Amino acid sequence: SNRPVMGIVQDTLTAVRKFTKRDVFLERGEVMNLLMFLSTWDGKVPQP
Amino acid sequence: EITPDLWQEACWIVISSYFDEKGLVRQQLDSFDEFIQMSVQRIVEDA
Amino acid sequence: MIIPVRCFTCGKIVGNKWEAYLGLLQAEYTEGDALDALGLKRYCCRRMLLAHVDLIEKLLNYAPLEK
Amino acid sequence: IPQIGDKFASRHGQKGTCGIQYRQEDMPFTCEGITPDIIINPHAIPSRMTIGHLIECLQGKVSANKGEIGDATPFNDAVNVQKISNLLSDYGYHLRGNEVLYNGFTGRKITSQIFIGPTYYQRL
Amino acid sequence: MNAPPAFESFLLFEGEKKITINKDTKVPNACLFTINKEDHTLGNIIKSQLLKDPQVLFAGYKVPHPLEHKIIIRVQTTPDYSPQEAFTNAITDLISELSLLEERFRVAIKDKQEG
Amino acid sequence: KPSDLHLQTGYKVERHMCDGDIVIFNRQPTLHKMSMMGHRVRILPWST
Amino acid sequence: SLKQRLKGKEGRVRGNLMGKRVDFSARTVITPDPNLSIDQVGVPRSIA
Amino acid sequence: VVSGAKGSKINISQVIAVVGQQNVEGKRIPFGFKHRTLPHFIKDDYGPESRGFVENSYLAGLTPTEFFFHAMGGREGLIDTAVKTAETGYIQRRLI
Amino acid sequence: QPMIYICGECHTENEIKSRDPIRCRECGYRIMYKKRTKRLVVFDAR
Amino acid sequence: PYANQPTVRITELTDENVKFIIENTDLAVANSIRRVFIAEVPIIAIDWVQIDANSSVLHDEFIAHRLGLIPLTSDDIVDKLQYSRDCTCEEFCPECSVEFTLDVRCNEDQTRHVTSRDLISNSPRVIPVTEQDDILIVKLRKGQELRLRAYAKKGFGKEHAKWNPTAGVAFEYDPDNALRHTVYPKPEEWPKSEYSELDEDESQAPYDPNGKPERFYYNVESCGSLRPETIVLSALSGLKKKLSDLQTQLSHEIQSDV
Amino acid sequence: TVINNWLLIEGHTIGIGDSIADSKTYQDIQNTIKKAKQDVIEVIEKAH
Amino acid sequence: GRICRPLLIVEKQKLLLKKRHIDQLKEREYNNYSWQDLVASGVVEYIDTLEEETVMLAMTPDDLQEKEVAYCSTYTHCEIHPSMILGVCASIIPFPDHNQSPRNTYQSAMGKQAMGVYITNFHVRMDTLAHVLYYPQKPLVTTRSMEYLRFRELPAGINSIVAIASYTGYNQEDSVIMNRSAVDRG
Ligand SMILES: [Zn+2]
Ligand SMILES: [Zn+2]
Ligand SMILES: [Zn+2]
Where do the annotations place Zn(2+) 5 binding (chain I) (predicted)? Predict the structure, then answer.
């Protein structure tokens, strides 16, 4: 059916829906904790 | 007289009396009991 | 079977409480009064005696195989 | 000894293997020192619809605080969830069993309020 | 069966370095510090102390896996200032405030037990 | 004996599998072609 | 009989030629892990 | 539900508000007794509660007649799940 | 060289021989229980 | 660029617990001191159980398990003992272990309770903690017995939970969430903390963006294996020792790079 | 990885607080059940 | 081979289970007043399935003998307790009417598979595959019917402080995170 089969399963999907809301803000330490887990991060912290 | 609203504790008394009298396996025991007490003699005489 | 030595969550030593818990039950307290008379504030320590079944007293009825 | 892969179940058809075992310092904890023994998925609830698991957990907090083995006959009408909540509120808890867990790794308290309390688990 | 023994959380072995420094190549002045046989109870304090320097541009740590006992602390500091220097100042600042905290705890015990 | 544990070029060695080996992983009932796929081995301690 | 040895789902064609028991295969319970990539399976040591 | 990770609006409606009409074979709970569904109901009772409509929710809990009618609908679902498997596998085998 | 078995219901102990019919001397009870081993056991208290 | 100066204020000190407040430190320092209360404090607990004889209804590994979890008075010996795997002895000695001996046969028609009192040490300081009753190890019918020798050794809570000195470590910061780390949907339903200082009209404190976690409230309840203040002293000493050994390995690695 | 590690900060649960509507909603539900039940009864008395 | 179950007996609109039966029935082992004396008293009787087609069965007396906008007012029997419609494995479920019914069926399957002290003389028995448990507990949340299956005497499972939390991601798809220190405490 020319679509993916993997997708994003349940708990990652609710946490990413709550994550990408408009009212979600992150402190500098929480950002540096999260960016530690990106494998594809080029080492540049984005502008807030 | 009757049991107006203490019925909730009065029914579990009669459930407890049932399972203290009968038990959980009266089917197996009473069935085998009536078998070996009456029905084996009925098989022997009905031959 | 026998009472656990520690509460599973805390690690509070609850194994020394069981016979005194039986004493406070037979001395006509409620179970909730007996627990905090033994001094168990956290409910995870209260379930350790409140819902124990002392099954080893059934196991001691049988005569010991080795003698 | 219970290890991961060992299959546990509630009294509601809520089975599941052990995913991981954390030590006590890694497990989250309330304002008091109480950590969980099990942490189950929140997604196990809403499609399976075992609300009786939640009510068993709430009546379990009420039972372990009150010091009595609580009653869960099915067709009662003397125990609904509002009476359970009013009994839980007297022991200094939230009405609906939610309790502020602190995180076990970072220590920052978790933004949501985690439903916690004692259920009865069966090892299969 | 396949239960790892209980001393795998903290005992090293022959041929295991406790700390391994790997200079990052993506950005200038950054290092990955691989600590073997530790957990969040070291890297969290080191991360929070490295956020207190005005000269650390990035301070993070992760465990790769919770069944394998190692952490990685990534440090990126400002140029002219080596991240190894920031790390060895974070450890000394922690030892400073913990020894001060221990002495003040002793004094508080002597206050409490003696009225 | 240690005299025949020598290796010259051309022997085979049936070695225990390490990280990075490829395995096929499936679930009965295998309905479609993504019910049987190839993974890379990672060696983790516990027995699952 | 011989025809009964061949005709079944447990026979020779379907039961032994089509689907047969294979060496080099393991079967254990799966438990989740979100800390490894989508093409990695974490096998035990005593399987490996 | 809004993320679509697990569940739907129907599960919210059945937990909070009302379980709804229980069905056996696409129609209501049939008269297994003589012209009544359970021996607690009067004969020829085509009402909501007699014929399997459950007005309670899973938060309030079901009355025993509603429990039994709900168990009937669930048994129909499990019969479907257990009988489906062999026929679908044989269709797959023939197609391949 | 004889093996000491515990006599089931009797709870007494007795010798036994190779190719010996298994009988107690007190009441001829047929079930014997082998005594606990004499070598050492050591348990990690974990 | 440096460490803030923390301070301690002890609200109570009992033989069970200690309740105190640590001000002017970071959150991760505070959480780590909690986690070192739970894990990294070493005490003395039984780890080598040799069952000489057993006839009790509980099997051997159950009795060795129950002898594991018994708390031992280790208030001053655990600083003197070496870790067992670190000692140069012939595999056990009085410098890395404490010998215990249990020898109980029930010769009476009463059910005889093998308690923690029947554990007999050779070291008079390291004895089981049990006013309070003794810790029930195993009950015995007449005819049954158990004899065993049990060596106790130094270890900490990461290794096994029988080396955990704490019953409970309550830890909370910002009990009226002025920081708003947790976000209550309806804060009227929520009970106030023990350390709340708001009047009963008010539910939770007003938000400040410029605030940070400070004034950490701890309640460290010991299980009896240590006094509740020497748990805290041993934890601070152990955390400073872990950091110092990490600094020594760091100095070796920096000298290896240069 | 990064959404699970944000979810440690956020946290996500489900509870019995999530299954209870306020009493105005329960009054609406019971009024609707009573209205539809009386409507079924009046359809029945038309059918008789 | 017919299959019956006892029901109370309702004369005009009143139960025949009077207060004096409860008074004589609380004091068992003294009056020797059994269940069979209550069957003999003409108060309960066994109704089988054919006869259920010709009986008007009150669910509970507190609702169904009081005058209202009357449903039938011609009851013959009254159910003793509705919880006695359930089996032995569906009786150990707390609040099973709040669940969904496939979940009740699946627990009825799993309750036969739970480890626990399966018998009291397990040390004598040479069973193949005996699974017994160290510290089994009775449920804090129990039914009344567990008193009669003797589930509080040979239980199967431990009361545990669960939390329902998304966490590191090892309780993802029907799995659970356990406490290593708790497991080390038995
Ligand atoms: Zn506890
Ligand atoms: Zn004899
Ligand atoms: Zn030594």
Answer: 26
Task: Cite the beta strand spans of J87-196 per DSSP E.
Answer: 98-105, 112-114, 120-121, 138-140, 145-155, 166-172
Query: Is the separation of the CB atoms in J159 and E9 below 8 Å?
Result: yes
Q: Which residues does residue L130 pair with via DSSP β-bridges, in sequence order?
A: none
- Beta carbons of K10 and D110 less than 8 angstroms apart: yes
CB atoms within 10 A of CB J95: 12
Please provide the CATH number assigned to the domain covering J1-42+162-258.
Answer: 3.30.1360.10
Chains with 3+ CB–CB pairs under 8 A to F are D, E, G
Nearby residues of J172 by Cβ (< 8 Å), 6 or more positions away: D31, D102, D109, J193, J195, J216, J217
Strand order across the J98-105 sheet? I43-44, J43-54, J145-155, J98-105, J120-121
Question: What is the spatial distance between Cα D97 and Cα K20, in angstroms, rounded to a whole number?
Answer: 13
Contact between E76 and J25 (Cβ < 8 Å): no
> Structural domain boundaries of chain I?
1-46
H61 chain-L contacts, CB cut-off 8 A: 95, 97-98
Q: Which residues surround ligand 1, an ion (CB under 5 A)?
A: C 7, 9-10, 12, 42, 44-45
Q: How far is the CA of D35 from the centre of ligand 1 (A)?
A: 9
Q: Hey, what are E62's tokens?
A: 């992760």
Q: Tokens for J213, please give them.
A: 């976690």
CATH 1.10.10.60 holds for C1-67: yes
Tell me if J66 sits within 8 A of J159, measured CB to CB. no
- Tell me how many residue pairs between chain A and chain D have CB atoms under 8 A apart: 7
Other Cβ atoms closer than 10 A to A46: 6
What are the residue boundaries of the structural domains of chain E, listed by start?
Answer: 1-115
Distance, CA of F34 to CA of F36 (rounded, Å): 5
CB contact, 8 Å: D91 with chain J? no
Looking at beta carbons, which pairs linking F11-18 to residues 24 or more positions away fall under 8 Å?
A: F16/G48, F17/F41, F17/G43, F17/G48, F18/F43, F18/G48
Residue of A nearest to L166 (CA): A11
Tokens standing for E1?
Answer: 């069966």
What separation in Å is there between the alpha carbon of L186 and the centre of ligand 1? 14
Q: Are F9 and F28 in contact (CB under 8 A)?
A: no
Chain-chain contact of J66 with C2 (C-beta, under 8 angstroms): yes
Residue J56, classed as helix, strand or coil, is coil
- In whole angstroms, give the CA distance from residue D84 to residue D97: 10
| CB-CB contact of J74 with J80 (8 Å) | no
Q: How was this structure determined?
A: cryo-EM
Q: Does I37 touch chain J (CB under 8 A)?
A: no
In CATH, which superfamily holds the domain spanning I1-46?
A: RNA polymerase ii, chain L (2.20.28.30)
CB atoms within 10 A of CB H31: 17
The CATH architecture to which E1-115 belongs is 2-Layer Sandwich (3.30)
Residues 6+ apart with CB under 8 A from L147: B16
Max CA distance (Å), chain H? 55
Does an interface of 3+ CB pairs under 8 Å exist between C and F? no
Q: Which residues of chain A are within 8 Å of residue K10 when distances are taken between CB atoms?
A: 15, 18-19
Please state whether at least 3 CB pairs lie below 8 Å between chains I and K.
Answer: no
Contact L109, D59 (CB under 8 A): no
> Is position L63 annotated as part of the catalytic site?
no
**Burial of residue D71 (number of CB atoms within 10 Å: 0-12, 13-18, 19+):** middle
> Looking at the partner chain, which of H17, H46, H59 has a beta carbon nearest the beta carbon of K44?
H46
What is the dotted CATH code of the domain comprising J43-161?
Answer: 2.170.120.12
Among candidate residues L88, H63, L77, the one with its CA nearest the CA of residue D76: H63
Rounded CA gap, H95 and L125, in Å?
53
Minimum-distance ligand to the CA of J154?
3
Q: Cα L109 from chain centroid?
A: 16
CB D16 within 8 A of CB L175: yes
